[PDB]
XYZ file of C-alpha atoms in Angstrom:
658
model
C 0.000 0.000 0.000
C 3.126 2.192 -0.066
C 3.920 1.916 -3.775
C 5.604 4.889 -5.441
C 4.178 6.516 -8.568
C 6.919 9.100 -9.173
C 9.472 11.344 -7.475
C 9.895 15.019 -8.371
C 13.370 16.379 -7.630
C 12.271 19.996 -8.266
C 15.467 20.762 -10.151
C 14.510 24.372 -10.900
C 13.772 25.415 -7.312
C 16.647 23.506 -5.705
C 19.119 24.725 -8.334
C 18.013 28.290 -7.621
C 18.483 27.712 -3.890
C 21.838 25.955 -4.357
C 23.231 28.527 -6.836
C 23.371 25.982 -9.669
C 20.526 27.356 -11.813
C 23.064 28.420 -14.447
C 23.870 24.726 -14.934
C 20.327 23.503 -15.570
C 16.658 23.748 -14.671
C 16.027 20.014 -15.267
C 18.963 18.122 -13.745
C 19.309 18.436 -9.977
C 22.610 20.061 -8.990
C 23.030 20.514 -5.238
C 25.896 21.696 -3.052
C 26.829 19.612 -0.034
C 25.790 20.596 3.472
C 22.566 22.274 2.313
C 19.055 20.749 2.229
C 17.122 20.218 -0.995
C 13.451 19.340 -1.430
C 12.015 16.393 -3.356
C 8.388 15.310 -3.719
C 7.510 11.627 -3.435
C 4.194 10.661 -5.032
C 2.336 7.484 -4.093
C 0.173 5.370 -6.380
C -2.607 5.132 -3.767
C -3.634 7.238 -0.757
C -1.472 6.606 2.304
C -3.684 5.579 5.221
C -1.360 5.573 8.253
C 1.457 8.107 8.021
C 3.621 6.964 10.941
C 3.829 3.229 10.046
C 4.528 4.143 6.419
C 7.305 6.454 7.606
C 8.703 3.585 9.665
C 8.570 1.434 6.509
C 10.718 3.680 4.259
C 14.446 4.429 4.145
C 16.569 6.354 1.571
C 20.038 5.397 0.167
C 22.486 7.774 -1.572
C 25.318 6.097 -3.563
C 28.097 7.589 -5.712
C 30.533 5.688 -7.926
C 30.922 2.218 -9.336
C 31.698 0.410 -6.049
C 29.832 2.421 -3.399
C 30.449 1.511 0.231
C 30.021 2.975 3.702
C 33.737 2.821 4.551
C 34.504 4.920 1.465
C 31.612 7.219 2.499
C 30.198 6.656 -0.996
C 27.027 5.010 0.357
C 24.695 6.351 3.048
C 21.445 4.768 4.232
C 19.235 6.962 6.404
C 15.601 6.959 7.555
C 12.949 9.570 6.829
C 12.243 11.115 10.230
C 12.408 14.369 12.168
C 15.144 12.786 14.326
C 17.657 12.528 11.485
C 21.062 14.170 11.765
C 20.687 17.338 9.690
C 24.487 17.727 9.667
C 24.716 14.266 8.030
C 22.618 12.449 5.439
C 19.003 12.777 6.553
C 15.450 13.208 5.310
C 12.302 14.629 6.905
C 8.749 15.035 5.630
C 7.894 18.746 5.702
C 4.448 18.814 4.064
C 2.249 15.820 3.341
C -0.895 15.342 1.306
C -2.708 12.013 1.371
C -0.962 11.158 -1.922
C 2.450 12.825 -1.576
C 5.294 13.717 0.786
C 7.473 16.820 0.490
C 10.839 15.633 1.813
C 13.804 17.811 2.784
C 17.075 15.917 2.275
C 20.396 17.031 3.763
C 23.930 15.894 2.997
C 27.056 16.250 5.151
C 29.307 19.267 4.728
C 32.181 16.848 3.989
C 30.251 14.665 1.539
C 32.046 13.048 -1.382
C 31.293 15.056 -4.519
C 30.131 13.550 -7.804
C 27.195 11.764 -9.474
C 24.807 10.298 -6.864
C 21.839 7.943 -7.163
C 18.920 8.280 -4.668
C 17.115 4.981 -3.863
C 14.084 4.259 -1.654
C 13.767 1.017 0.366
C 10.310 0.016 1.551
C 10.603 -2.586 4.297
C 10.425 -6.065 2.810
C 10.666 -4.789 -0.758
C 13.228 -4.279 -3.496
C 15.041 -0.966 -3.963
C 13.532 1.765 -6.128
C 15.746 4.331 -7.926
C 14.083 7.730 -7.334
C 16.616 9.544 -9.539
C 20.061 11.054 -9.948
C 21.628 14.268 -8.544
C 25.147 15.760 -8.735
C 26.755 16.899 -5.458
C 29.210 19.809 -5.460
C 31.349 21.755 -3.023
C 29.459 24.479 -1.147
C 31.205 27.842 -0.621
C 27.910 29.110 0.862
C 28.016 26.704 3.841
C 29.926 27.837 6.930
C 31.029 24.271 7.703
C 32.368 23.574 4.191
C 36.118 23.617 3.603
C 35.558 25.977 0.639
C 33.406 28.430 2.623
C 33.676 31.999 1.334
C 32.892 34.773 3.802
C 31.470 37.288 1.313
C 28.529 36.944 -1.057
C 30.307 39.268 -3.496
C 33.375 37.027 -3.424
C 31.217 33.937 -3.946
C 29.531 35.489 -6.983
C 32.851 36.638 -8.446
C 34.978 33.537 -7.843
C 32.331 30.837 -8.368
C 29.284 32.106 -10.273
C 30.763 34.610 -12.738
C 31.440 32.987 -16.115
C 32.713 36.271 -17.643
C 36.295 36.705 -16.452
C 39.300 38.790 -17.420
C 42.763 37.359 -18.058
C 45.465 40.010 -17.788
C 48.228 39.747 -20.396
C 50.785 42.203 -21.732
C 53.658 43.687 -19.732
C 53.837 45.032 -16.192
C 53.784 48.621 -17.479
C 51.126 47.936 -20.162
C 48.495 45.483 -18.907
C 45.856 44.380 -21.429
C 42.711 42.700 -20.105
C 41.372 39.941 -22.368
C 37.722 39.011 -21.944
C 37.511 35.293 -21.194
C 34.485 33.003 -21.146
C 35.170 30.580 -18.310
C 31.864 28.877 -19.089
C 32.018 26.685 -15.990
C 28.223 26.216 -16.154
C 28.133 25.027 -19.754
C 26.142 21.824 -19.913
C 28.957 19.304 -20.363
C 31.683 20.995 -18.287
C 30.596 19.332 -15.032
C 30.483 15.923 -16.725
C 33.903 16.499 -18.299
C 35.385 17.609 -14.974
C 33.991 14.609 -13.103
C 35.148 12.207 -15.820
C 38.644 13.689 -15.596
C 38.530 13.376 -11.802
C 37.487 9.732 -12.231
C 41.051 9.000 -13.378
C 41.954 9.273 -9.676
C 41.059 6.066 -7.836
C 41.037 7.508 -4.289
C 37.341 8.344 -4.343
C 37.131 8.675 -0.553
C 39.495 11.661 -0.832
C 37.111 13.427 -3.242
C 35.412 15.028 -0.229
C 38.625 17.038 0.288
C 38.946 20.178 -1.891
C 42.738 20.040 -1.554
C 42.930 16.526 -3.004
C 40.508 17.290 -5.843
C 42.355 20.478 -6.779
C 45.730 18.714 -6.711
C 44.524 15.804 -8.850
C 42.771 18.021 -11.389
C 45.719 20.400 -11.641
C 48.117 17.532 -12.304
C 45.783 15.972 -14.877
C 45.183 19.284 -16.657
C 48.910 20.048 -16.781
C 49.500 16.609 -18.301
C 46.765 17.263 -20.871
C 48.255 20.679 -21.660
C 51.661 19.106 -22.264
C 50.126 16.409 -24.472
C 47.775 18.653 -26.473
C 49.273 22.141 -26.847
C 51.058 22.142 -30.205
C 54.279 23.942 -31.162
C 53.780 27.093 -33.211
C 43.106 31.840 -36.698
C 45.610 29.861 -34.644
C 45.354 32.380 -31.775
C 41.573 32.917 -31.875
C 40.221 31.844 -28.480
C 36.650 31.286 -27.291
C 37.104 30.662 -23.576
C 38.031 27.671 -21.476
C 35.284 25.248 -22.520
C 36.406 24.554 -26.131
C 39.969 24.062 -24.890
C 38.798 21.608 -22.228
C 36.760 19.725 -24.832
C 39.718 19.508 -27.219
C 42.105 18.431 -24.456
C 39.797 15.691 -23.172
C 38.546 14.371 -26.542
C 41.166 15.479 -29.065
C 38.369 16.959 -31.203
C 38.339 20.683 -31.948
C 40.823 23.457 -32.550
C 44.126 22.778 -30.742
C 45.840 25.480 -28.723
C 49.417 26.346 -29.682
C 52.325 26.969 -27.333
C 52.102 30.744 -27.781
C 48.956 30.618 -25.612
C 50.004 27.902 -23.148
C 49.021 30.326 -20.367
C 45.417 29.259 -21.068
C 46.123 26.360 -18.695
C 45.571 28.702 -15.751
C 42.170 29.677 -17.142
C 41.142 26.089 -17.904
C 41.905 24.938 -14.364
C 39.947 27.915 -13.037
C 36.950 26.721 -15.039
C 37.077 23.135 -13.783
C 37.460 24.100 -10.129
C 34.661 26.641 -10.466
C 32.315 24.032 -11.923
C 32.955 21.712 -8.958
C 32.291 24.418 -6.355
C 35.920 25.382 -5.492
C 36.214 29.230 -5.633
C 39.086 30.062 -8.046
C 40.627 33.008 -9.913
C 43.327 33.415 -12.605
C 46.324 35.490 -11.468
C 48.888 37.047 -13.853
C 52.461 37.625 -12.613
C 54.603 39.887 -14.796
C 58.360 39.326 -15.107
C 58.215 35.832 -13.606
C 61.500 33.947 -13.132
C 60.543 30.512 -14.449
C 62.742 27.442 -14.644
C 65.296 28.272 -11.941
C 64.491 25.271 -9.735
C 64.486 27.399 -6.593
C 67.693 29.223 -7.502
C 67.444 32.997 -7.075
C 69.714 33.875 -10.021
C 68.831 34.332 -13.692
C 71.615 34.432 -16.282
C 70.915 36.444 -19.437
C 73.336 36.461 -22.357
C 73.721 39.206 -24.958
C 76.204 39.825 -27.758
C 78.086 43.065 -28.414
C 75.054 44.414 -30.327
C 72.836 44.123 -27.251
C 70.943 41.201 -28.806
C 70.504 37.557 -27.807
C 71.734 34.762 -30.066
C 70.054 31.611 -28.765
C 66.398 30.872 -28.182
C 67.003 31.181 -24.440
C 68.175 29.534 -21.246
C 66.133 27.151 -19.113
C 65.829 29.759 -16.375
C 64.166 32.755 -18.035
C 62.251 35.835 -16.916
C 58.905 35.414 -18.668
C 57.113 38.614 -19.647
C 54.103 37.151 -17.844
C 52.887 33.858 -16.405
C 49.300 32.890 -15.469
C 48.460 30.834 -12.351
C 45.309 29.375 -10.786
C 44.563 30.436 -7.197
C 41.856 28.411 -5.353
C 40.100 29.126 -2.005
C 39.952 26.500 0.729
C 41.092 25.590 4.219
C 44.250 23.524 4.784
C 43.424 21.048 7.577
C 46.628 19.037 7.066
C 48.880 22.116 7.376
C 49.847 24.109 10.474
C 47.088 26.458 11.566
C 46.835 29.792 9.765
C 47.218 28.759 6.104
C 43.531 28.760 5.137
C 42.530 30.963 2.202
C 44.066 31.478 -1.239
C 46.139 28.499 -2.466
C 48.273 28.511 -5.672
C 48.019 25.399 -7.907
C 51.614 24.619 -8.998
C 52.098 21.655 -11.388
C 55.625 20.258 -11.635
C 56.243 18.871 -15.150
C 53.577 14.754 -12.969
C 52.257 16.054 -9.653
C 50.634 19.311 -8.569
C 51.083 21.098 -5.246
C 48.808 23.560 -3.458
C 50.878 26.362 -1.930
C 49.293 28.778 0.579
C 49.997 32.321 -0.829
C 51.225 33.388 2.679
C 53.989 30.752 2.582
C 55.319 32.331 -0.613
C 55.202 35.784 0.978
C 56.976 34.675 4.168
C 59.458 32.378 2.415
C 58.273 29.318 4.354
C 60.330 26.924 2.251
C 59.444 23.493 3.599
C 55.737 23.962 4.232
C 55.118 22.426 0.797
C 57.558 21.170 -1.857
C 56.646 23.895 -4.374
C 57.183 26.903 -2.078
C 60.815 27.312 -3.145
C 60.053 27.466 -6.877
C 57.179 29.922 -6.440
C 59.289 32.116 -4.156
C 62.156 32.138 -6.659
C 59.738 33.003 -9.468
C 59.070 36.411 -7.865
C 62.323 37.013 -5.949
C 65.143 35.989 -8.304
C 67.799 38.487 -9.375
C 68.967 38.875 -12.972
C 72.652 38.710 -13.935
C 73.513 39.928 -17.441
C 76.515 38.564 -19.341
C 78.109 40.027 -22.459
C 79.151 37.410 -25.020
C 82.247 38.557 -26.905
C 83.168 37.431 -30.409
C 86.443 36.159 -28.933
C 84.364 33.825 -26.749
C 84.943 35.768 -23.536
C 81.837 35.787 -21.326
C 82.161 39.048 -19.402
C 80.061 40.198 -16.477
C 78.058 43.368 -17.049
C 76.942 46.334 -14.942
C 73.227 45.967 -15.635
C 70.158 47.825 -14.444
C 68.099 46.000 -11.832
C 65.452 43.860 -13.546
C 62.667 43.421 -11.000
C 60.614 40.221 -11.032
C 57.129 39.500 -9.741
C 55.604 42.808 -10.825
C 51.967 43.905 -10.752
C 50.451 40.571 -9.761
C 46.973 41.116 -11.160
C 43.543 39.501 -11.107
C 39.952 40.472 -11.831
C 38.349 42.725 -9.249
C 35.295 41.657 -7.286
C 31.998 42.914 -8.679
C 33.509 44.942 -11.525
C 35.553 44.768 -14.709
C 38.389 46.555 -12.893
C 41.855 45.127 -12.278
C 42.900 44.261 -8.721
C 46.613 44.336 -7.827
C 47.353 41.564 -5.228
C 51.208 41.800 -5.336
C 51.150 42.696 -1.588
C 49.754 39.173 -0.824
C 52.869 37.564 -2.426
C 55.679 39.962 -1.518
C 56.757 42.634 0.930
C 57.697 46.056 -0.494
C 61.134 46.124 -2.099
C 63.778 47.393 0.303
C 61.503 47.009 3.330
C 62.549 45.512 6.654
C 60.166 42.560 6.302
C 61.446 41.759 2.813
C 64.960 42.057 4.230
C 64.235 39.513 6.966
C 62.523 37.070 4.606
C 65.363 37.233 2.081
C 68.053 36.779 4.740
C 66.224 33.792 6.223
C 65.803 32.128 2.823
C 69.434 32.829 1.881
C 70.582 31.344 5.190
C 68.470 28.229 4.647
C 69.802 27.725 1.119
C 73.403 28.297 2.228
C 73.059 25.784 5.065
C 71.424 23.221 2.773
C 74.127 23.641 0.116
C 81.683 51.655 -13.297
C 82.992 55.103 -14.302
C 80.086 55.199 -16.767
C 76.449 55.170 -15.656
C 73.711 54.289 -18.150
C 70.012 55.075 -17.740
C 67.386 53.851 -20.210
C 64.012 55.584 -20.571
C 61.455 54.007 -22.897
C 57.689 54.202 -23.356
C 55.653 51.395 -21.856
C 54.121 50.677 -25.274
C 54.874 51.143 -28.971
C 51.851 51.774 -31.250
C 51.331 49.130 -33.915
C 53.133 50.269 -37.073
C 53.736 53.444 -35.080
C 56.487 55.587 -33.621
C 58.119 56.041 -30.225
C 60.948 57.961 -28.575
C 63.551 56.442 -26.251
C 66.265 58.193 -24.256
C 69.685 57.023 -23.087
C 71.413 59.080 -20.402
C 75.150 58.388 -20.187
C 77.075 59.914 -17.282
C 80.880 59.883 -17.270
C 82.315 59.825 -13.742
C 85.928 59.683 -14.953
C 88.208 62.711 -15.058
C 89.177 61.784 -18.617
C 86.718 62.168 -21.467
C 85.490 58.758 -22.601
C 85.093 57.220 -26.054
C 81.926 55.123 -25.701
C 80.277 52.660 -28.075
C 76.502 52.498 -27.532
C 74.713 49.476 -29.000
C 70.905 49.592 -29.092
C 68.901 46.474 -29.861
C 65.201 45.747 -30.377
C 64.282 42.055 -30.430
C 61.006 40.130 -30.448
C 60.356 37.853 -27.465
C 57.415 35.567 -26.787
C 55.478 35.875 -23.541
C 57.472 32.964 -22.080
C 60.800 34.726 -22.679
C 61.721 32.756 -25.811
C 63.488 34.932 -28.371
C 61.407 35.358 -31.528
C 63.051 37.765 -33.986
C 65.864 40.319 -34.143
C 64.160 43.506 -35.328
C 66.484 46.508 -35.048
C 70.080 47.332 -34.178
C 71.843 50.688 -33.924
C 75.462 51.574 -33.138
C 76.471 55.031 -31.901
C 80.049 56.157 -31.256
C 80.044 59.034 -28.774
C 82.572 61.087 -26.819
C 81.619 62.132 -23.278
C 83.284 65.086 -21.594
C 84.496 64.437 -18.065
C 81.807 64.696 -15.376
C 79.193 65.624 -18.002
C 75.828 63.930 -18.424
C 74.604 63.390 -21.984
C 71.146 62.451 -23.281
C 70.790 60.664 -26.628
C 67.245 60.645 -27.969
C 66.493 57.844 -30.422
C 63.500 57.207 -32.642
C 62.053 53.694 -32.391
C 59.938 53.272 -35.531
C 58.217 50.144 -36.826
C 59.284 51.108 -40.353
C 62.938 50.645 -39.335
C 62.425 47.041 -38.198
C 64.115 44.387 -40.328
C 60.884 42.345 -40.201
C 57.418 42.563 -38.712
C 57.291 41.257 -35.112
C 55.484 37.925 -34.742
C 52.000 38.260 -33.306
C 51.650 38.029 -29.508
C 55.299 39.045 -29.023
C 56.842 41.890 -27.041
C 59.822 44.127 -27.770
C 62.963 43.598 -25.711
C 64.842 46.903 -25.888
C 68.492 46.768 -24.830
C 71.229 49.376 -24.472
C 74.899 48.454 -24.005
C 77.624 51.052 -23.422
C 81.264 49.959 -23.692
C 84.184 52.323 -23.071
C 87.790 51.842 -24.216
C 89.281 48.768 -22.478
C 87.728 48.906 -19.008
C 86.395 45.331 -19.550
C 82.999 46.313 -18.040
C 79.964 47.496 -19.997
C 76.833 49.251 -18.783
C 73.592 47.514 -19.735
C 69.920 48.421 -19.548
C 66.851 46.563 -20.757
C 63.114 47.147 -20.945
C 60.023 45.315 -22.170
C 57.688 47.222 -24.497
C 54.192 46.104 -25.445
C 52.819 46.659 -28.938
C 49.703 48.841 -28.750
C 46.953 48.162 -31.281
C 44.133 50.550 -32.233
C 41.493 50.978 -29.555
C 38.194 49.215 -30.283
C 35.551 51.478 -28.743
C 32.176 49.931 -27.878
C 29.194 52.202 -27.188
C 26.163 50.514 -25.627
C 23.507 51.565 -23.097
C 24.469 50.762 -19.518
C 21.068 49.166 -18.839
C 18.715 47.291 -21.147
C 15.276 45.703 -20.987
C 14.925 41.973 -21.562
C 13.199 40.928 -24.805
C 13.705 44.373 -26.374
C 16.069 45.431 -29.178
C 19.382 46.997 -28.186
C 21.953 48.703 -30.411
C 25.720 48.757 -29.881
C 28.084 50.839 -32.016
C 31.712 49.787 -32.502
C 34.261 52.406 -33.568
C 37.836 51.805 -34.693
C 40.352 54.440 -35.782
C 42.956 53.222 -38.283
C 46.169 54.701 -36.870
C 48.317 52.375 -38.989
C 50.219 53.373 -42.123
C 48.385 51.007 -44.503
C 44.724 50.219 -45.207
C 42.824 47.652 -43.159
C 41.763 44.889 -45.569
C 39.913 41.583 -45.207
C 37.948 43.299 -42.477
C 35.884 41.058 -40.177
C 34.060 41.924 -36.946
C 32.571 39.194 -34.741
C 30.176 39.730 -31.832
C 29.361 37.272 -29.055
C 28.360 37.109 -25.405
C 26.486 34.716 -23.147
C 22.869 35.724 -22.596
C 23.043 38.259 -25.451
C 23.892 36.370 -28.654
C 23.485 32.695 -29.484
C 27.072 31.593 -30.204
C 28.553 34.392 -32.362
C 27.943 36.446 -35.492
C 30.644 37.531 -37.947
C 30.239 40.442 -40.362
C 32.460 41.953 -43.040
C 33.018 45.711 -42.987
C 34.595 47.852 -45.672
C 38.328 48.439 -45.884
C 39.472 51.396 -43.771
C 42.107 53.745 -45.151
C 44.756 55.234 -42.842
C 43.412 57.955 -40.519
C 39.821 56.885 -41.306
C 37.350 55.403 -38.816
C 35.078 52.386 -38.969
C 31.727 52.861 -37.219
C 29.531 49.742 -37.343
C 26.162 49.348 -35.610
C 24.788 46.002 -34.404
C 21.242 45.363 -33.179
C 20.356 42.395 -30.980
C 17.752 41.501 -28.370
C 19.030 40.389 -24.940
C 16.996 37.473 -23.608
C 18.673 36.662 -20.254
C 18.284 38.953 -17.250
C 21.415 39.885 -15.309
C 24.844 41.419 -15.810
C 25.729 40.363 -19.364
C 28.799 41.144 -21.456
C 29.158 41.835 -25.175
C 32.514 40.858 -26.691
C 33.640 42.248 -30.056
C 36.598 40.870 -32.023
C 38.136 42.536 -35.087
C 40.395 40.828 -37.635
C 42.099 42.336 -40.680
C 45.261 41.969 -42.741
C 47.098 44.337 -40.362
C 46.103 42.649 -37.089
C 43.996 39.752 -35.862
C 42.035 38.811 -32.745
C 41.715 42.419 -31.551
C 39.140 42.023 -28.784
C 37.227 44.390 -26.537
C 34.189 44.052 -24.300
C 31.413 46.065 -22.692
C 29.046 45.134 -19.872
C 25.299 45.773 -19.849
C 22.682 45.031 -17.193
C 19.589 43.383 -18.681
C 16.495 44.004 -16.541
C 13.275 42.019 -16.731
C 10.291 43.703 -18.415
C 8.222 46.141 -16.392
C 5.351 44.231 -14.817
C 2.028 44.764 -16.584
C -1.216 42.964 -17.435
């Protein structure tokens, strides 16, 4: 008399309550430690409620070999006496033909695909349905608990992120579609996690993050090809291609996408995450705090590069969680650090305080933002002379997306003390001590702009100061080379050789025009300009050296759109682009996209734009999803490709009427 007709999991309402509505309105996605409501329907009216309640139990199971000892199987009754901090179920409302049941799960539940079964006493099991269980940053007792609602929305719910590329002095924000709530991303993430056979550990955010970081780094190494090829559409297509091998591969010039991809996967599983960009990052030193750079007498570099190089920038995934297995006080932001393999989670604080030994990867991360650069001059004779070089600072302008805005947040102070400060002094001395125990007349100043306009012009200055009593015959070599984001030399562009005489104790300023038209060849796309100056005097055996990184600045893509918009109404956005280049823009394509605004994307062809002329193209579209949406516009032409910009708009529901 207790037969079951159907069970409604109320996916829409529960997903709204559990902040998973972006995933689906049909499949039940719930976050652990928080109750969700189901409705059990009976084939016939239920006469006696209490005996029927005594007759029914529920079973949750996850995995292929569920068991209690693995905590992948929980059997619990349906009663008001159930442990609400554990698996439990209680009837809240009851009609003669149905029970509204509130089901809780423990705050440390194993995440993944779960089956819910109902056992009537002296009867065979009945599958009620399936649900997916995720980490819960909204629950105080969860290891991934986030204090702030704004932080939860930014680091877990926002699918429209910003990845900061460029150079420390010229930071370019690229709109990125994390897409963590795309339909198949959760399934892909859980299938990837299934490669780890320690399912009982899946209740631990630290273990899940470590496993997924290692697996994603392995996939990146296997799938990213050696060098449009640079046209990106967010994390989700990359994840699909990496896991299936189908789709457009990513090439090494954009290997930094790994940090974004990880951020997607974590975010889909309920682990708050953010992508952090570190500019001038000393990669490949193996904990050593010295970087050797080698230049020839023209101020240029001959080889592709050393193993230890100062990358123009490096992306990293930070994830939020407690660290129960570490000494107290390391809860909060953790850095995922793969090692060519296995991945380590490093509390950001440990990097700041130089706590080398807390985790294996602390030393490498600390060296990445604390190493010192030594410059060597390579002589044609073969002599490898030491050089008096300008200080090349590492770990600059550590940047991430700000909370509740499209603004850039600098978080450098979380990773490092101010240069020259007492605290930095103490940390550096302690680290130097640990490593030790375990194991001129001319002054040159280089002034350059932070950016060089595409096919444009710039001015650079070299101040040479002679401290000798004798006037000096100086040879000044100036070199402009192309370098990839990861510090790999790309192309020698320009070289200049001045022969100057400096009067004793007299400063002298040489102004030099840095013009694209003088380059021996166009810089490869996504490269930066390494500018070098090398002054050598007579036979002193020592040469002054200065270097700078310059970003290439492309024409600004202005987007003009209303700040607010009404759902289900037309909305116009005008895109303007001024051709500041020296040649016409041909093969002109403009693509528009954005989640909740445009289904997939739309590409249009606009007319060729002569130099000093302006494109002004208007697009009309109807937003259909309420909320803070983003329009992304991408321009391609024969002069430049993948020139992206974005603009946010708040779509409001229609005014209530009859």
